[PDB]
Amino acid sequence: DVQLVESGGGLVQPGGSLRLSCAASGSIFSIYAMGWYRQAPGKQRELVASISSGGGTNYADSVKGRFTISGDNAKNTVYLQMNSLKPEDTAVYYCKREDYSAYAPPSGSRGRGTQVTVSS
Amino acid sequence: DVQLVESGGGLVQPGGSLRLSCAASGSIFSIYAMGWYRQAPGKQRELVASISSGGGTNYADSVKGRFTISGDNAKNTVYLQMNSLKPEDTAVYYCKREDYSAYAPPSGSRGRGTQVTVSSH
Amino acid sequence: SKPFTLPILTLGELTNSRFPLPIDVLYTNPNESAIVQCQNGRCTLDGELQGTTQLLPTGICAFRGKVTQQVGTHWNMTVTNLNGTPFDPTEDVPAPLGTPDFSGQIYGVISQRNTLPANRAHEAVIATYSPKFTPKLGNIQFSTWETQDVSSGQPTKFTPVGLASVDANSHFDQWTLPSYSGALTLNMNLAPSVAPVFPGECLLFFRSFIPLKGGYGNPAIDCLMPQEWVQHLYQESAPSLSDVALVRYVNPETGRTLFEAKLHRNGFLTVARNSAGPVVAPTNGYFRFDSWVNQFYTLAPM
Amino acid sequence: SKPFTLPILTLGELTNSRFPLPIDVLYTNPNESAIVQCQNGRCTLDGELQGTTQLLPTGICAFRGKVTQQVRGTHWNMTVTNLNGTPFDPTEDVPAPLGTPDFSGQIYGVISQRNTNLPANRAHEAVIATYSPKFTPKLGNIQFSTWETQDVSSGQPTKFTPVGLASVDANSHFDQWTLPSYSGALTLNMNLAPSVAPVFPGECLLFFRSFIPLKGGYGNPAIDCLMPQEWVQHLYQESAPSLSDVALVRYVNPETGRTLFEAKLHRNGFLTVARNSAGPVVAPTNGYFRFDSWVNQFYTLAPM
């Protein structure tokens, strides 16, 4: 199985920034995609940003230009640099990874999630 | 890793008949060819008869019409029915088998041989 | 579970599946307004032929049958299946396999061998937009420059060469399907239309340039997969393990990845490209299957 | 150590490798006196293309190049390139440009041109006599004749699409086993794919036979190839190491599972069968060859 270790949650002053990190270990494959989902209070899950092993990236329109996703392949870790944060960004942020193979269907893993609060 | 046990050798009155048998065991394959070679005294080895798993048969011109080769696949055994024997058929008769595979080159095995003597004496 | 594979043939070793032509270039056109629903060169990744797609390269845009009578100089021809058996209209296909899947005036040679037999051959044109183009009904028409030397009731073969014209009155449109049963009837059992379902993506085509009998133009035929891919997928019949296969266009000399694409399970490619026009790539390049992915995977920009 | 395989395409799903035609029937002719040394459709079992063999079905008996000038009717001279448009280098170790026709006759087809806004075009029926002294593809030059008298352009990109034969009359010199003189007169062919023959008594060559269209006249001419073009394409890609000189293949009816007959598929890319009779082989069109084992000369083919 695959394990995802999340970090970088907490309380942040509006207009400020936060960096989330997700490190994958275990039965990981060379071809993959890692991303973040978030769930705002009294709302449903939404894609924030994802990055693929080929280098492609996908962003939600709500965070385009403010958030940047990247990775360090040597550490099998992805980073979410969240800049210019506003109260509406307040949510639980979840790490997601899909591992891909030529010989098997895509296999998915997910993280416990970290609380990000933007206020005052 | 294939074993061949020959049988049916001995002395025979000319004009008479003999039956040779060769049974294969061990690492045999479903596709194969089994045959008999002979070496007459003061002469070199020559093909007598062979039979293949597909049903094809090959005979030396010298034994055509007198010798018949056949097999019982259930016993993994081939038989050489030698009829109308003459003194010139006197030789050591050797069993030979080729085992064939889709995944490997042909593998060959041979028997120790049996003495067949045809003479009035 | 048998592993999915693609032919390792390079671009210069591939053939168009919608007309008997070599693949010339890879091509994209995001600004395409027409619905893309070609019927030849259609095969799922697990080997299911669709539309009017058949395996023979000689079968593409070919016709077999018999001339019934003369109707310029026009001739009526019953069409059979390419293997010589009569075409059954009740079969779940749009038309006999190999039937042309686009509008235009297709130029070629009609040849006959009588049931030693006598022979004849002449240049001919088949207008696929014409009301009397009804292959689904087992009947088509072709015109000849030759006025008399065509025989009725004798075995007839059409060998495709190119287009007669691409002038305005020749109605060449590679994405407009023929009316297989002619006027006032709808096409049936069609292979489904294809499109990118993701923003920033467009279709990737294998493009071949098609000869002209006369006039001005540089007309091209775009197919979703080359005929060799159709043949390969059909034989392997490998189970698809997701809805999108990730393929990389690889330079074998250097080992470099020129770009990556999505090979969709219905048998077509998409790429992340903003530009239209030919794709600048080595002709000894080839697509390599690297993994089964899903919509979470994002293609790198081309 | 990659396993050797054949395509599972049936007879009706196969194409001739010596002319762009579907396979029609399997065929034998033990009484053939001519040397069998075709140059197209030549490929070893481990994937080495030989002779003038190339991969494209559209490439077979095709020509690319440019008409230089007009020269018994209306004749045209044409420089020939490689099929990919690069110039042909005569010093390469091949008999002729890949795809060049490998037999004597009058090959009928269409010559089309697209000039170097929109380019002008033209196309006309044409005939190429491969027995003619001026058929010299190895020298990068060939000749073709047209019924059309003037509408062919010099110095413009030219393509020949093969359709069939012009004639099989005595004066058309059709012989499928007679190679052209690729460099013309008084020169010998070079870098030829080797001749093929049965080397065991009671065996003959097995052919994939296609019937070829005629522009006019009487006849039912045929082209026999050693292996279908799909086999060439398949063998080339796999490049599976050959584990003996002969692969044992069975012609199988998939509907019934019955073996109709067996054959030897030799290393140089040709089949032999144990058959005394000549003519077409009576067999289902949904039949196909199945690779069952690597064998040797000790194995004897069952009579057909």
- Is the Cβ–Cβ distance between D4 and D183 less than 8 Å? no
Among residues C181, C172, C168, C174, the alpha carbon closest in space to that of C125 is found at: C172
- Residues D242, D48: Cα–Cα separation, whole Å: 11
Identify which of C72, C22, C214 has the alpha carbon closest to the alpha carbon of residue D111: C214
Give the 3-state secondary structure of residue C256: strand
Question: How distant is the Cα of C111 from the closest Cα of chain A, in angstroms?
Answer: 48
Radius of gyration of chain A (CA): 14
Tell me, what DSSP letter sits at residue D269?
T
Distance between CA A111 and CA A96 in Å, rounded?
A: 6
Position C24, amino acid: D
DSSP collapsed to 3 states, chain A: CEEEEEECCEEECCCCCEEEEEEEEECCCCEEEEEEEEECCCCCCEEEEEEECCCCEEECCCCCCCEEEEEECCCCEEEEEECCCCHHHCEEEEEEEEEEECCCCCEEEECCCEEEEECC
Answer for the pair B38, B96: CB distance below 8 angstroms, yes or no: no
Question: Beta C139-144 vs D246-253: how paired, if at all?
Answer: unpaired
Which CATH architecture describes the domain D60-166?
Beta Barrel (2.40)
What distance in Å separates the CA atoms of residue D51 and residue D180, rounded to the nearest whole number? 13
- Give the nearest partner residue to B56 out of D1, D291, D301, using CB atoms: D301
In the DSSP assignment, the letter for residue D302 is: P
Residue D55 with chain C: CB contacts under 8 Å: 9, 13
Paired with D203 in beta bridges are D274
Amino acid at C107: Y
d(CA C124, CA D110): 12
Q: Say yes or no: C82 contacts chain D, CB-CB below 8 A.
A: yes
Resolution of the structure, angstroms: 2.1
First to last CA, chain D: 33
What is the distance between the terminal CA atoms of chain C, rounded to a whole angstrom? 32
Q: Is some CB atom of chain D closer than 8 A to the CB atom of B10? A: no
Smallest CA-to-CA distance from C146 within C119, C110, C114, C118 is with C110
Topology at the third CATH level for domain C1-59+165-302: Nucleoplasmin-like/VP (viral coat and capsid proteins) (2.40.510)
Residues of chain C with C-beta less than 8 angstroms from the C-beta of A105: 241-242, 292
Helix extents (H) in chain D: 229-238
Report the Cα–Cα distance between both ends of chain B, in Å, rounded.
40
| C-alpha to C-alpha distance for C221 and C106, rounded to whole angstroms | 12
Count the Cβ atoms, other than its own, within 10 Å of residue B57. Answer: 17
Name residue A87's beta-bridge partners.
none
Q: Where are the domains of chain D?
A: 1-59+167-304, 60-166
CB distance B95 to B110 below 8 Å: yes
- Tell me which chain A residues have a C-beta less than 8 angstroms from the C-beta of C3: 102-103
Tokens representing B66?
Answer: 């007198």
Sign of CA dihedral D289, D293, D294, D298: negative
- Based on the number of CB atoms within 10 Å of its own CB, is B66 exposed (0-12), middle (13-18) or buried (19 or more)? middle
d(CA D226, CA D39): 10
Task: Look up residue A61 and give its amino acid.
Answer: D
**Could you tell me which of C123, C150, C277, C135 has the C-alpha nearest to residue C212?**
C123
CATH of span D1-59+167-304: 2.40.510.10
This structure was determined by X-ray
Tokens of B4: 């061949």
User: Residue D173, class by beta-carbon neighbours within 10 Å (0-12 exposed, 13-18 middle, 19+ buried)?
Assistant: middle
* Pairing status of strand C286-293 against strand C220-223: unpaired
Per-residue tokens: A79: 């980073």
C117–D220 CB contact, under 8 Å: yes
CATH of the domain at B37: 2.60.40.10
Distance from CA of C248 to the nearest CA of A (A): 10
Q: Mutating which of C248, C288, C296, C302 best tests the A interface, going by the most A Cβ atoms within 10 A?
A: C296
| Distance in Å from the first CA to the final CA of chain A | 41
d(C-alpha D300, C-alpha D304), whole Å: 12
Rounded distance between C-alpha atoms, residue D207 and residue D196, angstroms? 12
Instruction: Sheet with A77-82: list strands edge to edge.
Output: A2-7, A18-26, A77-82, A67-72
Number of domains within chain B: 1
| Contacts of C197 by beta carbon, 8 Å cutoff, 6+ apart | none
Q: The tokens 């004066």 sit on which residue?
A: D171
- Cα maximum dimension of chain C: 65
User: Does the C60-164 domain belong in CATH 3.40.50.1950?
Assistant: no
Give the tokens for residue D304. Answer: 């057909």
- Residues of chain A in contact with residue C272, where contact means CB-CB under 8 angstroms, are 56
Place of tokens 């059992």: C189
What's the domain range around B54? 1-121
Residues in Cβ contact with C117 at an 8 Å cutoff, skipping those fewer than 6 apart: D218, D219, D220
**DSSP assigned state of C288:** E
Beta bridge partners of D208: D26, D225
SS3 state of residue C13: helix
**Strand, helix or coil at C235?**
helix
What gap in Å lies between CA D60 and CA B3, rounded to an integer?
A: 52
Q: A23 forms bridges with which residues in the sheet?
A: A5, A77
Cα radius of gyration rounded to whole Å, chain B? 14
Identify the closest residue of chain D to C16 by CA–CA distance. D58
Question: Which residue from D250, D263, D237, D293 is spatially nearest to D46, judged by alpha carbons?
Answer: D237
Residue listed under structure tokens 């039937």:
C99
Question: 3-class SS at D236?
Answer: helix
Burial of residue C131, with CB atoms counted within 10 A of its CB: 0-12 exposed, 13-18 middle, 19 or more buried: exposed
Tell me whether B24 touches chain D (CB under 8 Å): no
